[PDB]
A paper describes a structure:
Based on our hypothesis that the active site loop opens to allow for product/substrate exchange, we made a G459A mutant as Gly-459 underwent the largest main chain movement upon lid opening. The additional methyl group of the alanine side chain likely restricted the movement as anticipated, and the mutant showed 20% activity when tested in the enzyme assay. The crystal produced after preincubation with substrates belonged to the P43212 space group and diffracted to 2.7 Å resolution. This hydroxyl is also within hydrogen bond distance to Arg-339 (dO-Nω = 3.0 Å). Asp-633 movement places the conformation of the CoA binding loop in a position between “out” and “in,” 1 Å from each as measured at Glu-632 Cα. The Mg2+ is in a pyramidal coordination with two water molecules, Glu-434, Asp-462, and one malate carboxylate oxygen. Asp-633 then moves toward Mg2+ and displaces malate so that the malate carboxylate group is within hydrogen bonding distance of both the Asp-633 and Arg-339 side chains (as observed in the malate-bound structure of the catalytically hindered G459A GlcB mutant), possibly serving as a hydrogen relay to restore the Asp-633 and Arg-339 protonation states for the next round.
GlcB generates malate and coenzyme A (CoA) from glyoxylate and acetyl coenzyme A (AcCoA) following the conversion of isocitrate to succinate and glyoxylate by ICL. Because of the essentiality of the glyoxylate shunt in infection and the absence of it in humans, both ICL and GlcB are attractive targets for drug discovery. The active site is an ∼20 Å-long tunnel located at the interface of the TIM barrel and a loop comprising residues 616–633 of domain II. A Mg2+ ion required for activity is bound at the bottom of the active site tunnel in an octahedral coordination by one oxygen each from the carboxylate side chains of Glu-434 and Asp-462, two water molecules, and two oxygens of glyoxylate.
Numbering used by the authors: 2 to 71, 76 to 301, 312 to 379, 382 to 673, 677 to 726
């Protein structure tokens, strides 16, 4: 086969050629020595990688036999202390993570997550640190299409004015005047290096004049006004010549907000990458972002302003980018050993995306720049416990050697999405104490893990109910305490999950405020538009101060984290039960087809209620596991799931385009088969992970196109 041989490794040609002719030029790193690091690191670190995975299965099997007899909560706690699932909590400590960008240490705002494989969205996500508030309010349902405000083909003046009014109220709410509002405003000036606003009768200044930050144009009549609030910036574009500002009282054309302050470029649950050719598309895009020459169009440059002091300064016009690698589980045949075994895709992701990130700290090569303090930011998903965190640090050290970068350059975003990590979260941070820039609650995976771990105990509650169970409410608060009790304020981000309802922007703006009220300096949005709307929340809420007043407090006991979410012993009705089955089969079929048939890892799949859900691979983990739990405890038969899948499939076909229908040949469509395997084999998948079945089935389709 077409694999370059280097030591004990057979490296697929497209990978070797890409690492050699694209990623290595500009790193000051010698090719034969790089590849030697790859061989050496893989040889030394593979065993421990393997041992950790075996360790998970040990615990998961021990926990199964326990639930097959034993309904106590204090012997269950003691039992997990025996098997080394629950480890002692260390003495309180402070993190020591140096060389971190201001976007992570102090600034608090929304955080975008994007499939790196999609060169188009990754482009937008990087340019989404700035976004029109007008566009955002106008397009979505934030301003109700209620009274002549309906979106049409031509511009709606009724809807446009309502948008303006809304932005007017936000300006009053964030950067208040000394007397009056921005609604009565008529013009802007910066006299004496101070912002003064014209009113119809008088002229007021800024009640808090420090919130004035700059401007562009003439000082006595600018082309723009720059404001700050809660770290985030605000731009009032002044142009009475544009078709908005002509009918506008102050000439305001638009309001621009600092939206996606950071973006996570994603190699894991939002992308489909099952072979060596796939990983290179991802790497080639990640490369583009780091040189700053990726195009479809280009990436944005810095934004120049004029200080109130008189000088001229600059602001980053791109979102500080993370990259998220895959977890420890999977292996990818982008590299095989001499015996043919697939090499761990985690280790490859650390090496390659690590290597590629070198361009991010430098201008030609490539013209544009990412980090300013010299840091690489890797999100690690799906870790189970302190030792799996330690291993990843050691890997970063080993990878750092190979690339010849100072130790602790590769910072680590820790993700709380596995039950064993949650209950040992202080230990985990401690293992990453010199690297960690990020913790985060990922309910979707966390719920996936929660179901599978206690799946021998009994029938589990519906997935709609899971978001308000005491384990998850504990979990959320528990995550913030540990980060804050570790010194996270002014040092690292404390973050929370993602808004999936991509078109319910009204609900989001109404609901998502709870997360920075819970003291989190970052929360996950699906779109550049959702980032802009979600910026509003950080202006309204002083997250720095919320963080402060939570300090020291212990809101979540270990008794409340092990509260398993069973149901109250046969308390449903056949109509409900089949509603849950049909609904879970809906979110599974809808997602798998795009994933298997087209290799798409994240898409708005209309649910059973026609609600556009931005579903990624984690949502597949909840639905499949839940159904598997209801299978295992006799809530439904195997014929139900089958009758349901057959029932829900042609409706999925009706929600979809060079597209390949599942119905009516359910046994000839690889998508359908993959679907019901995730359910029927679901209880047997490790920690409920969907990847194995998802990958073989995607490769078995690539292959079916000879
Ligand atoms: Mg997850």
């Amino acid at each position: 086969t077409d694999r370059v041989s280097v030591g004990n490794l057979r490296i697929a040609r497209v990978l070797y050629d890409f690492v050699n002719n694209e990623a290595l030029p500009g790193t000051d790193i010698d090719p034969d020595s790089f590849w030697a690091g790859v061989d050496k690191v893989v040889a030394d670190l593979t065993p421990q990688n393997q041992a950790l995975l075996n360790a998970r299965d040990e615990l998961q099997a021990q926990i199964d036999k326990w639930h097959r007899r034993r309904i106590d909560m204090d012997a269950y706690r003691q039992f997990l202390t025996e098997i080394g699932y629950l480890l002692p909590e260390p003495d309180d400590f402070t993190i020591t993570t140096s060389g971190v960008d201001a976007e992570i240490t102090t600034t608090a705002g929304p955080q975008l997550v994007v499939p790196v494989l999609n060169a188009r969205f990754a482009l937008n996500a990087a340019n989404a640190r700035w976004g029109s508030l007008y566009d955002a309010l106008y397009g979505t349902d934030v301003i109700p299409e209620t009274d002549g405000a309906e979106k049409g083909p031509t511009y709606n003046k009724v809807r446009g004015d309502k948008v303006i009014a809304y932005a007017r109220k936000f300006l009053d709410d964030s950067v208040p005047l000394s007397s009056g509002s921005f609604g009565d405003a008529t013009g802007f000036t910066v006299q004496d290096g101070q912002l003064v606003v014209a009113l119809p009768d008088k002229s007021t200044g800024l009640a808090n004049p420090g919130q004035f930050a700059g401007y562009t144009g003439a000082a006595e009549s600018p082309t723009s006004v720059l404001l700050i609030n809660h770290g985030l910036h605000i731009e009032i574009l002044i142009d009475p010549e544009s078709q908005v500002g002509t009918t506008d009282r102050a000439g305001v054309k638009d309001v621009i907000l600092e939206s996606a302050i950071t973006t996570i470029m994603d190699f894991e649950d939002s992308v489909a990458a099952v072979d060596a050719a796939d990983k290179v598309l991802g790497y080639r895009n990640w490369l583009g972002l780091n040189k700053g020459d990726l195009a479809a169009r280009v990436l944005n440059r810095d934004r120049n302003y004029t200080a109130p002091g008189g000088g001229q300064f600059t602001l980053p016009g791109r979102s500080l980018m993370f990259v998220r690698n895959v977890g420890h589980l999977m292996t990818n045949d982008a590299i095989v050993d001499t015996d043919g075994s697939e090499v761990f895709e985690g280790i490859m992701d650390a090496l390659f995306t690590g290597l590629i990130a070198i361009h991010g700290l430098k201008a030609s090569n490539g013209p544009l720049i990412n980090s300013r303090t010299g840091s690489i930011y890797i999100v690690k998903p799906k870790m189970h416990g302190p030792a799996e965190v330690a291993f990843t640090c050691e890997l970063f050290s080993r990878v750092e050697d190979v690339l010849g970068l100072p130790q602790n350059t590769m910072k680590i975003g820790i993700m709380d999405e596995e039950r064993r990590t949650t209950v040992n979260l202080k230990a985990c941070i401690k293992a990453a104490a010199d690297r960690v820039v990020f913790i985060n609650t990922a309910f979707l995976d966390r719920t996936g893990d929660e179901i599978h771990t206690s799946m021998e105990a009994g029938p589990m509650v519906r997935k709609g109910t899971m978001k308000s169970q005491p384990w998850i409410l504990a979990y959320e608060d528990h995550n913030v305490d540990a980060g804050l009790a570790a010194g996270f304020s002014g040092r690292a981000q404390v973050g929370k999950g993602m808004w999936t309802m991509t078109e319910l922007m009204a609900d989001m703006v109404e609901t998502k405020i709870a997360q920075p009220r819970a003291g989190a300096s970052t929360a996950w949005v699906p779109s550049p538009t959702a980032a802009t709307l979600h910026a509003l929340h950080y202006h309204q809420v002083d997250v720095a101060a919320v963080q402060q007043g939570l300090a020291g407090k212990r809101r979540a006991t270990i008794e409340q984290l092990l509260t398993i979410p069973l149901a109250k012993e046969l308390a449903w009705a056949p109509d409900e039960i089949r509603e849950e089955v049909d609904n879970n089969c809906q979110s599974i079929l809808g997602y798998v087809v795009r994933w298997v048939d087209q290799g798409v890892g994240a898409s708005k799949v209309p649910d059973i209620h026609d609600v556009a859900l931005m579903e990624d691979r984690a949502t597949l983990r909840i639905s499949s596991q839940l159904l598997a739990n209801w299978l295992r405890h006799g809530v439904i038969t195997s014929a139900d799931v089958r009758a349901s899948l057959e029932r829900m499939a042609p409706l999925v076909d009706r929600q979809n385009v060079a597209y390949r229908p599942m119905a009516p040949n359910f046994d000839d469509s690889i998508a359908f088969l993959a679907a019901q395997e995730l359910i029927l084999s679901g209880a047997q998948q490790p920690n409920g992970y969907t990847e194995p079945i998802l990958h073989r089935r995607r490769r078995e389709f690539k292959a079916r196109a000879a």
